[PDB]
Design a protein around this ligand. Structure first.
Ligand code: ADP
Ligand code: MG
Length: 861
């Protein structure tokens, strides 16, 4: 079935050098076996424990900026008394209201919002109780108004200086957009009374009488200092059950016991909030409601029948169909695959909607950007859905806020607004003048399985709660309609609620947070959660952090673990960054790491890459080198001003926003290493060639192999690769390593590390970089067994290599790990390392070279 052992052509000069270094370091060499039926394993090999602790809290004061977490000295507000600040801010606001007519008009829109009438009740509830829950339908105005109500209360009652609100949002798009919206509602830009703080981007508001919208991750990273100088904490959209939100509620519950002066406000959609109420000591529930219209529901049976639709040529619920429908309806529906969504039926539904002769927008719920793009392309093919008749606007996370705000804009009468949206438009935002809803009844979820390291962006069935919420979006302006694209049988076999993220998400990052914040045991703390995670996930987290040496045997945070907890990326990439610093390639490795948090900068449109994009790869057969190369080129082109940058990006077909955000992310990652004590000169930008000899890039590739482990694969032919599991898989179309057409690629090595192992119809390897066999042994393997002439790597691939070489390379890995520990104890030692460590690093540098494994990337053969 599987392939023969790969020939590894290693020179004796290098084989000796390896043995000499291992001699010099005096590392324990696992000797060869006597009989070849004895596979010998070449692999080689504290503070006191806590119990529990609470995050400290303190209220706002005048000489303290809670967003920058520092004193105010230089400014005039260092001495300024609270009363002065309060009165000045009040007078400023009063003057603005009487002068600005556009602001008056905006305030008048605010007063018509359903939540307005509950202003008094909400404010009293907050003042009387440490914790409250505000429950109400989506579109009432919980998110935008409640923080303002609270702030304007403190302003207008001459105590503006005692008000600092933190507002948490599950999404990045929400934290930014809400801040922009609230600012506009107060006649400001973000920076004055409102601000935002997400990962790798922030606009901090003023120190006094200010609202800070943020993601939960940002807030948690700041809590090691404490919740210093905050009057209110608003946790929004709790019903979505974001894992970080659920986690925060655990922390906040401990806070309100020890510090009952703080105010917590939980805000929720129309769901059963018993859980949350009971969790927070039977806190009050303030109900919020407004204008609602009855919405007529339809299902796939109904939709097919009234459109007379006919398609092309769990159990299948499209086979099941009641006998109060036509024979054509049964026959037609039975041809539809449930695992697909019927794009042509949606097209038909749009055409049916305009025969009703009632003008209004159509909100179409689709799982991900792919099915939005596919639906969008489908429509614009047909001339009927053109500029004269239709305004088709996509709404997902990965488009500029320029285009996102267009969904709220009105349209000329005669044109119908169609929004192709994700679940963002389910409970988090409310698009206006929506009369019709087409619902796919799907969700998009990350399902990660640790055993095989498989990522699945799975399209899954939504809950009854989801379908009811999506149905509710149609009836805010007038009686609406909702077209569910699931069978009436399927509806019955839907779960009532989605699985919360706490049940199905890796917990290693939350585990690091727990230890950073000194909240006690990982298992102990997560047991107190509203709905605790499964045991295996906790064990998996503990296992992951032990492998990295983030935790010691006592499960206490090591110096290395402290750095990984501070870095807002995957811990494994954090460690790779640290290794990069040791090798003086920290900038490149920080660039690689940053880019994992954002979309691909290449605008490929889901196709194979063209000439321009592939050239960036050089002769390295690497998507990561391509990334680094576009950053080198982009940074050069950016020298000549903003317009020169734009032209470069749209000439090279690059997403300029992605490159900018990634750069800024890199700067902040570097910032945190500097503070942790890493020297400046191991994090400098370093020019590199992607074609010629370059040992700096060699090391990056070696370090990349560590980061993405255990994503390794072996090329057979065309696009077929073998995974770690043993199963076969495809090269992703995006890759520079994907054959452009017929001409097969002559890879100098069959081994590739890669970013994601994606589950779809088949196993796909995305973001692929070629590595040599030596790099495989060094950084892209845990377990290796030698019989004398053949080596077995992680019980999936075999190599024909010297025993001594394999054991020496495995010893280097152990030596490097030992140094990483020593370095994290005292990071500044990389400035001047003793000769023996430099000898170890130099040998790894040599092993990272293509020529080390008898490869020459110059001669394409
Ligand atoms: N960017 C925006 N443009 C136009 N209207 C908006 C925008 N953001 C929010 N709104 C409107 O503000 C109102 C309240 O929305 P929001 O505060 O998000 O409600 P909730 O969180 O209670 O569901 C709604 O009518 C919504 O359409
Ligand atoms: Mg809301």
């Amino acid at each position: 079935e599987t392939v023969e052992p790969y020939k590894v052509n290693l020179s004796q000069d290098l084989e000796h050098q390896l043995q000499n270094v291992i001699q010099e370091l005096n590392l324990e060499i696992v000797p060869p076996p006597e009989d070849p039926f004895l596979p010998v394993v070449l692999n080689l090999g504290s503070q006191r424990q806590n119990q529990i602790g609470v995050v400290p809290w303190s209220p706002p004061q005048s000489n303290w900026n809670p967003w920058t977490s520092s004193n105010i000295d230089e400014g005039p507000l260092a001495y300024a008394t609270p009363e002065q600040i309060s009165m000045d801010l009040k007078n400023e606001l009063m003057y603005q209201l009487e002068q600005d007519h556009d602001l008056q008009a905006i305030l008048q829109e605010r007063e018509l919002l359903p939540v307005k009438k509950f202003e008094s009740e909400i404010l009293e509830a907050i003042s009387q109780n440490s914790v409250i829950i505000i429950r109400g339908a989506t579109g009432c105005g919980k998110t935008t108004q409640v923080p303002q109500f609270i702030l304007d209360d403190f302003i207008q009652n001459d105590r503006a200086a005692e008000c600092n609100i933190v507002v948490t949002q599950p999404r990045r798009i929400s934290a930014v957009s809400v801040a922009e919206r609230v600012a506009y509602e107060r006649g400001e830009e973000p920076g004055k009374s409102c601000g935002y703080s997400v990962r790798f981007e922030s606009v901090l508001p003023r120190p006094h009488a200010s609202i800070m919208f943020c993601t939960v991750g940002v807030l948690l990273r700041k809590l090691e200092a404490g919740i210093r100088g905050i009057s209110h904490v608003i946790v929004d959209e709790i019903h979505e059950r974001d894992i970080n939100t659920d986690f925060l509620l655990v922390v906040l519950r401990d806070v309100v016991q020890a510090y009952p002066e703080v105010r917590i406000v939980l805000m929720s959609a129309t769901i059963d909030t018993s859980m949350f109420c009971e969790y927070f000591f039977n806190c009050p529930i303030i109900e919020v409601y407004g204008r609602t219209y009855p919405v007529q529901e339809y299902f796939l049976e109904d939709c097919i029948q009234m459109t007379h639709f006919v398609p092309p040529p769990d159990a299948n619920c499209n086979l099941i169909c009641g006998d109060e429908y036509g024979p054509e309806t049964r026959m037609s529906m039975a041809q539809l695959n449930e695992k697909e969504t019927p794009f042509e039926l949606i097209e038909a539904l749009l055409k049916y909607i305009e025969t009703l002769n009632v003008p209004g927008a159509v909100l179409v719920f689709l799982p991900g950007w792919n099915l939005i793009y596919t639906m969008q392309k489908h429509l614009e093919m047909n001339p009927h859905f053109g500029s004269h008749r239709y305004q088709i606007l996509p709404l997902h996370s990965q488009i500029p806020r320029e285009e996102q705000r267009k969904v709220f804009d009105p349209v000329p009468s005669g044109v119908t607004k169609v929004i192709l949206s994700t679940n963002i438009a389910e409970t988090s935002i409310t698009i206006n003048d929506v009369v019709y809803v087409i619902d796919s009844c799907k969700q998009k979820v990350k399902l990660f399985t640790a055993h095989n390291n498989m990522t699945n962006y799975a399209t899954v069935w939504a809950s009854k709660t989801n379908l009811e919420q999506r149905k509710g979006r149609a009836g805010r302006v007038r009686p609406g309609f909702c077209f569910h694209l699931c069978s009436r049988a399927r509806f019955e076999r839907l779960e009532t609620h989605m699985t919360p993220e706490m049940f199905r998400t890796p917990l290693h990052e939350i585990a690091l947070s727990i230890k950073l914040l000194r909240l006690g045991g990982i298992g102990q703390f997560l047991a107190k959660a509203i709905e605790p995670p499964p045991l295996d996930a906790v064990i998996e987290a503990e296992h992951t952090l032990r492998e990295l040496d983030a935790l010691d045997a006592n499960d206490e945070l090591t110096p290395l673990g402290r750095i990984l907890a501070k870095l807002p990326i995957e811990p494994r990439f954090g460690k790779m960054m640290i290794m990069g610093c040791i090798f003086y390639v920290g900038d490149a490795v920080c660039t690689i790491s940053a880019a994992t948090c954002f979309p691909e900068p290449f605008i490929s449109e889901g196709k194979r890459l063209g000439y321009v994009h592939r050239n960036f790869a050089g002769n390295r057969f690497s998507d990561h080198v391509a990334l680094l190369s576009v950053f080198q080129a982009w940074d050069d082109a950016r020298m000549g001003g903003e317009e020169a940058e734009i032209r470069f990006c749209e000439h090279k077909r690059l997403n300029m926003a992605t490159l900018r955000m990634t750069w800024e992310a890199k700067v902040q990652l570097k910032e945190i290493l500097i503070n942790s004590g890493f020297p400046e000169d191991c994090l400098l930008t370093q020019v590199f060639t992607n074609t010629g000899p370059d040992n700096n890039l060699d090391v990056v590739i070696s370090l990349l192999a560590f980061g993405v482990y255990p994503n390794v694969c072996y090329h057979k032919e065309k696009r077929k690769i073998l995974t770690t599991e043993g199963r076969n898989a495809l090269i992703h179309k995006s890759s520079v390593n994907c054959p452009f057409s017929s001409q097969d690629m002559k890879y100098p090595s069959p081994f590739f590390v890669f970013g994601e192992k994606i589950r779809t119809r088949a196993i796909s390897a995305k973001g692929m970089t070629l590595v040599t066999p030596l790099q495989l042994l060094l950084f892209a393997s845990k377990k290796v067994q030698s019989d004398g002439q053949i080596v077995l790597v992680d019980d999936w691939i075999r190599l024909q290599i010297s025993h001594e070489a394999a054991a020496c390379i495995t010893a280097l890995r152990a030596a490097m790990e030992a140094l990483v520990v020593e370095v994290t104890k005292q990071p500044n030692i990389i400035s001047q390392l003793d000769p023996v460590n430099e000898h170890m690093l130099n040998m790894i540098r040599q092993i990272s070279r293509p020529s080390a494994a008898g490869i020459n990337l110059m001669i394409d053969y």
